[model samples]
Target: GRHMELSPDGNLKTTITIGDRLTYDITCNGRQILTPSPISMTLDNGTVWGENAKLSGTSRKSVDEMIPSPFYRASELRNHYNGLTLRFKKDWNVEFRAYNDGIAYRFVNQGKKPFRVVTEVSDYCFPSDMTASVPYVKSGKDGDYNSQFFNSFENTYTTDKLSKLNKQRLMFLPLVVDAGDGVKVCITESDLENYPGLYLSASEGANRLSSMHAPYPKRTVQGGHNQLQMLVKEHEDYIAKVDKPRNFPWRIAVVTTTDKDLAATNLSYLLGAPSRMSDLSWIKPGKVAWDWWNDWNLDGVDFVTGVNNPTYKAYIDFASANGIEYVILDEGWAVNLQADLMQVVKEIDLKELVDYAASKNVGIILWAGYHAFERDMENVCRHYAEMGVKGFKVGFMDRDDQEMTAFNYRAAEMCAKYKLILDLHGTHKPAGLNRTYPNVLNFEGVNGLEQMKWSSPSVDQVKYDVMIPFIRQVSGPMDYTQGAMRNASKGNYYPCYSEPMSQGTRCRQLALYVVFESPFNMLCDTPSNYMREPESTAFIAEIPTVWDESIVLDGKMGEYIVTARRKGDVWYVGGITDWSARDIEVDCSFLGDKSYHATLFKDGVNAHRAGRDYKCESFPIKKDGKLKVHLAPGGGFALKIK
Candidate 1:
């Protein structure tokens, strides 16, 4: 057995051994996070890797560097760590890195010839039958590869014992496990490009999780939202076809001693490939006035309320007046259900809207279906950029196989070349693409507020909202599209396809601006709604999308969270609760020795009856003061300190 000790406090350890196969184990704070787990891969030509492999060489190194992120948690990120690399026989190697927060490993291929991978062997054997938060892929009655593999990567998390996980379902990444002795471990992957994303499956009665990947598409049927997805019809025997001499994606286990540490760790960003673009000043992150969820139902407007010049012009004017940076013309500007982006509807003119928005110092982002966008990637970007369009919100990708993964990178690169930013919707979870290409601002892989349009009660979006930041948002920015003025309690909530209402209180919607991380945020309600609620809308508009520094004040998984983020001298705090009312203490200790005025939005005394009821007030607090916040059922709180 080979063992490596880490952490100056002597709390973390990693061990690897080989007998019948190679296995690795991880321990944290004198607690076993993972038991002996097998790791191997097989090629198509009946060649098994990692079996009977001998260690040929080993090396060690240290890294300490400062990374500049203009739009992330902090302006400057310190990545200081130590690493070990082991070379095996068969020209393959495995590298391990140890950070103060977590551990990461990746497989490196050094073979001379291209190879086809039939399958990979990786497992996570927990020491005990502990509870875990698992997001399982949605499957239908067929349960075949085609039915199981094709999904939107959107599902609510279930907290259950590891052995109780449904064996028939596939679990998504960022799965969290509660190890004994005050430790938690999260499993996720980073830098995933040109490969199928990983899914996990548990054994029948064992406390273990094994990896699974989508097989290569043998036949596909392209049909979903204007044929945006290439749905798998059948799969080949192999999983991936790889060229020689490349490194696979990193398998990361973010170990945390406290739930707040889970929210603050930036392991994914640290493990991601660094920025490829040298000139990043052109990338801008801000709020946008979106037209989709509102269904272009702009009341009190002189023109007809459909997709037309007058309607978009009204949206642009509202955005300009509210200090919003951009307005999106979603899904009706072009010919409906047509894949040709060049063909526009007679009522809408792209160049005219672009020129009109530019005069008001506002930008326009056009929405396109995946097929049309990918087919004319270069031409569409160049055409819009020349016409003063700011960016694009490409939608309906809906797949994450190897080809689709490669397409994401290619499209982002092209968008960067033309100086256009991208917000990908109907897509998989972000796997650190924003770090690689700064122009990729947001990804809508989360089951967010938009689901309220047609989702049923089982969605439980309120609980899901509190759950996402620790799991999904850790990967990168999410396009939650959160500003909903009309709020509802469980009894009053119902699905309305045209005009929608959020499940929580109005303060909860306002709190999301501070709780969730989105470089390009959105106001998902109608312009008339925002105009009616001036105070809440004003507060949302003034909030900054990027942060200079961030701190997770307190939190528990899937129940509640309190976060504080700083933009400059001003600090913003947000707290949200599940369906139950609760009380939390807001500590001002982080605001060192200064008297600051705070504008707070809190749930009203009667908010349980009327979800839209909220109180807006201003008060002064000194350093080291604590405030008691009472949240109504499905309620929230937000504060702006200056």
Candidate 2:
């Protein structure tokens, strides 16, 4: 046969045409959706894997089951797929898996220790010149492709047509492309160990996106912001070096007809390699009372507050009082530039604080820079875990080359050995690493709320909040650090480093707790301010960090989002909008047939001008009922029904 075809479900299918070159085309409901794109890989062994491909045989498989999901948004994930593998004559093969939500493929080479990959030709040629949202790299140096390879992977989107995208700039995944007529395909890569992360760039004068990767680091130096980052000085010509037979990362394209369903798709986690741990009971997912974002500000205290032990003790006291599970001592806990985990600052007592937190039933987590942690990871993990520390938040490795990608996994592996939790910051997106190492609970790969501390008034964070759940969040959980007490309207907002205020209504901040999927969430506010606002503080403290079930009730791209999530018998529904007001209907049909008590937090009449103003209401409701939700301009609503 000259061609082979496969489909996960009847509505979505792909046909692969095998000739002198290997190309595949996708169709939805019998209509062409993707143009035939060629796939090829060239190794340094002087063999082009997909050129003149001759198939020796083929295989197929299927899956339909549910698996337990731990430390995640949902308690279970449905594992369903239709797979096909094409084995060619050259000892190399490509495997394809089709799901109802998306399709993915990966290359496998069965060879002994040898060469490196010069390049992999993966082109996503769409059928039409369509609009897409690209989070282009805030490139360093000259804004060239090489400079683009080094960044924090955090930027607001630039929406433009495929043909109009900037040719010189590179964009990171997972990027969403609107394929016209209420369909979208988000392109990303998963299971990204021992390989460089995927990036996309514009193809001049064509409706296509070409795959780009950071070249192997030929030279690097330990110097960057905070003196903690490894700056790439030179790059090799090849993308990755391979020394043994192994499976490559999966190139995934998630397809969805509606915006709400896009955020709910679990293709990334389901396609990931299963858990590598045997006993997974140590990892705990909960909210952290963070110190950095709020600048450790305390009021009406007997002593001055800063980054010392007294301030951290106050944070621990607040957490214990509110029943929050953990507190983060972010930066300034160790001597600056020492690159040693054992060097503690003079003003803090680590052992006494750990013991105090243990007494209050609160766990303490430490922040470590990349150089400090990687310099002695195993020893650090062992020391901290033995000290009753709950976890670590590793930060500031801004490149996603093969070296950095693999180093993160090494840290995850070693941390798992000691039963410690890990939260990755200043790094690339989570390409299913959380599933492989359930100990890693979150990753900072989005333009999070922390940027509001320094960004200008025109950054458009409101739209970014509504957009990330469909794009960057599709890959995995993000460390967005959202919970602000000082909220502001569009005209009355300004960036404050010490007392940071978000650019939205007060209720909008509450709604973010539901719209985003972060297991290791953060209450990024001052304890004094939250104490002044007791009702909002209590609500934030009681919100569950992990969910038993999740449903993206309704949403629109960059406009608004309504999410419903449940833990046990309680249901939390949240709605958020951009700069414009929105009216929505939230159906309570998921409660089955029972009466439940409900509490509603909504924007006040003056919230459009005074963003901190909000309304709190309570009532009793029955199943099969509906609630009309109104969102002010840059406002939102949060409803708790139990």
Candidate 3:
């Protein structure tokens, strides 16, 4: 039995032993593009190669029941540019592609019980990977759905050579699962929070850091190989079949890089699929005007509606005049909020405000606290429906529990019933919800404008801003409330907005409209402030919140980012920098194979330098594909093409 074997250097042969244990000799097929060499394995417990081992179905039976098993477990037959066949046992196999820059793989298992996730081997390491175990905790309550687990892991690799690089490669393993008849599909809170961790670079001395996170895994491994240590009492009965599934496990891949083009191209090639942005072009192209904190000042209050009807009227007028379509009355509008909700809705004149905005052809969006409605769902939806509000911006939803996720779905369902649009704020990361509910305009799961006010600006923000389009944005539209035109001196900014937010520079404000994508985007600065700078306001008026097509041209995490978006024949490009100034080129090749004239709005050295002053210029452009742009520290640039 021990003598039976396959070719030692070319082919691998597997044989069943006395029990369920199987033995095999893995032979080298050959090395191809991005393929890693296989690691040899030693079997001491199992029987010889010619005989099968006893398969155990009981306690202490098989390696499948062990804790800390590898999550990925399967690899499918796929044709690559290079010739190579990744073999597996029991129709389950995980494969990884080796590259000089990184490594990744995919997992394929189909069943109900214990699920698995896997990745390709890589040289890089983070402290979390070496740790023995981390506690798996969740927040759940009776009458509500149980909380799921999520793990967001990340690593920072140190490297030198500041510039002169164009691209980098990233690898990932796929995680697939199938829900059995009796078992439901459940993503623990921990799962939603922790999966798909980031792999990035940080500054070792003075050079810029570069890195990216995997959107999915690249390899497959058996569920028995890597299992979460924690167990649930309810799942004990079905533990036997946890290692294998009845169907196919989900397949995922990863790609990381310094060169934007290389990353996009190699990633596209690896997946054999187009980027999600190009595939899902359902996002309608139009102009969206958002009401940020300015609405508070308009009403004389901060977040809620204050007693300044005159100020409110002025803001409404400003919105109409500026080509802004949506006017959001954020937080504090609910009647019994933080009190008696039912009683509050009864007294509020929601119809009056919405009707007033409609008269000017503007849509009205109102804010509601999440907890407020959870206790009284009936009155909230019904009353708001009758009020003619076009949408609702919900807040205070921090937990990613089954209950909360289910509630969000319910809210979306209910909103749809009344033809109301929904935007979830302070919520968990999106998981393809937009596909299920188109009316659910956007989500604020990100640390956006709110952070610009409170937390010190992070260099990572620049990278996240760039990475999100390829990673996070794939899930759905994001609401990054923007526009702070009042320029501020470094360190002079105060903490939270006890009153109104401090003024940001005009260029900083304009850059946001182009840098960020949102269906119902906000024009957050004050009406008076906007009016003071027509040089800047003119461009703002033309910026479209919803775009026809979006492109992430060049970027790295925590360094700088450039984005180009198209609406009709016009393309608007926005570029943002972290601390130091940068000179970037904007390629107009996305101009749909045509020539165009471009009006550039950049930081002015000196021109119309007054209250929120700005200098802008216009020039002609050809579709040959590229526009060069220069930005200042913590600065940005925007362009309009026709």
Candidate 4:
């Protein structure tokens, strides 16, 4: 048995042991973040990489550099870590890294021929029976293996003790756990390519968490709700087939001492593979006028409104008028279940809409079903790009197996080659693909606001709103699609697909624009509704989708969070709270010594009773070096200073 240790600059330390098995433990600021956790890789030839492995050699180094990743929360990420690489007798090595914020590890195989990975073993043991916030996969049934492996990857966190997690149910990644004494742990992965994504489930040990990956699809059919998804009939023994020298996805554990630090976490991006594209000038990020969640329900129009050219033209006009960069035609533009992206539905002419949007100095992004887009991806990209189409919102992938994961990379490359934006929906949580492929901006693995369209009255979205920034957001950007004219309180909400409303104050929706990291932002309300609330719409339409800098000023996980983002000279700040009303005076010291004026959108006096009630105020900021914010139950506030 041998022991190895590494500490990145901060108070974080990692200790690894090589005995009959390879195991590691972590600590942050002298607090035990994890007990001894074991990791292993298996091959189809019955060779296990972790069992009684010999350490052939070892190397250690320090990495401190900035990665130039455009169109993100920050244009460049400061990646600093202490790296330790352990070489084994086989043609494989384990690369371990300890960053100030967290610890991560990956397997690098230097094999010549192709091989299949039968499975993997990664068990994270907790030192105590700590409470964890888990996001169970949204699937068909509890124990249905086929259905369990395939899910939308969108659900709110259920706070429970780690031991209490259902062993039968698979959990989503980037799950946060409360390690008493104010420490937090978020588990996720990065640099995932040619491999199945990891899922967590309760281990046999009382306080341990184990990993699971979807086996390669042995039998799959082209059928689902849209007749476009690949349904797994049977899965093979292997998780992925590898060729050439390869590096597997990184297993990341972000350990932070406070929710504020978690909200501003960027360990995933820093650990991710660098940009595959050298030129980043073509990747543009901005607000989009989305039509799907509103169900194409246009109010106060002379023509018939549902899924017609007239409806899309109205949307383009609204986008142009409000200074939005693009308008997305979601789900209805293509012929349903046709599986051919080239076949446009007769109800709406895509060329005409693209030309019309071009005339208005706006861009048109079309929705693409998974099967349809994948079948003829290159042809579709060439044809649509030639027609002046700006980008695509691809959806219904539903699974993150190796094959499906490969398709996303292919799509990102194709979209980037055509100078088109890529917004991925109905997929698993992102593991820094947004950084690897700069054109791939938004990742929709969140229990987004659109769920409120048909969600039950008991849903606690306001709390979920505050929870994401610290957990799911640590993985990558989320396309939460926040914005709705019809707002509601916790006690005053109902589901209406055609005329949907949000579960928080009007200002809360606006605040999300600043709090969340969405390089490609979406306004999910109807055009007519936005027109009625011009002030809020202006804030949504005007904020920069990508920021030059961001800071988490204050927050308590699941209670409230305040984030401030800067783009050039102007700074925008936002805050959101749960169902409890409270007041917080934000410290504006981040603005430097420069003086600036500010405009505030805050909850009105009666916002608790009437969720849409909000007030706008104009004042000189930096005078007192602080700003006061008052939020109602299910409420938020926003500020713009320059």
Backbone clashes in model 4: 0
Query: What does candidate 2's lDDT look like per residue over 391-493, in tens digits?
Result: 9999988889999999989989998999889999988889989999999999998999999899899988898998998899999999999999999898777
* The best candidate in terms of lDDT: 2
Candidate 3 or 2, higher TM-score: 2
**Candidate 3 wrongly placed segments (more than 4 Å):** 1-253, 258-292, 298-311, 336-341, 345-348, 375-379, 456-475, 489-492, 496-505, 592-595, 606-613
**Which residue pairs clash in candidate 2?**
none
Better of 1 and 3 by lDDT: 1
Better of 1 and 4 by TM-score: 4
lDDT: worst 10-residue window of model 2: 1-10
Tell me model 3's lDDT, rounded to 2 decimals.
Answer: 0.44
For each candidate, give its TM-score against the true structure: 0.97, 0.98, 0.60, 0.98
Tens-digit per-residue lDDT, 501-570, candidate 3: 3223356557767766566666666776678767677687777665555576887544667877766677
What is the per-residue lDDT of model 4 for residues 1-642, given as tens digits with 9 covering 90 to 100? 555555556688888889888998997777777988999999988888898999899998998888875787876778888899999987899998888778889999987777889989988999989999999987767766557888989999999998888878889898988988889889999987768999998856878889889989888889986788888888898999988788899999888888898888788888777778877787778988788899888889999898889998999999999899999988877788787787778898887889999999999888888988898899889999999988899999999899888888889999989988899998988897887888998999999988888899877888899899998998999999989989987778998888889997999999999999898998999889999988888888888988888889889999999998889989999999998998988888888678898999999999999999999999887835777789999899999998
Instruction: List candidate 1 segments past 4 Å from native.
Output: 203-205
Runs off by more than 4 Å, candidate 2: 1-6, 141-143
The TM-score-based order of candidates, best leading, equals: 4, 2, 1, 3
**Per-residue CA lDDT of candidate 1, range 473-557, in tens?**
8788899999999999767888887789999899999999989999899999998999999999999999999888899999987
Better of 1 and 2 by TM-score: 2
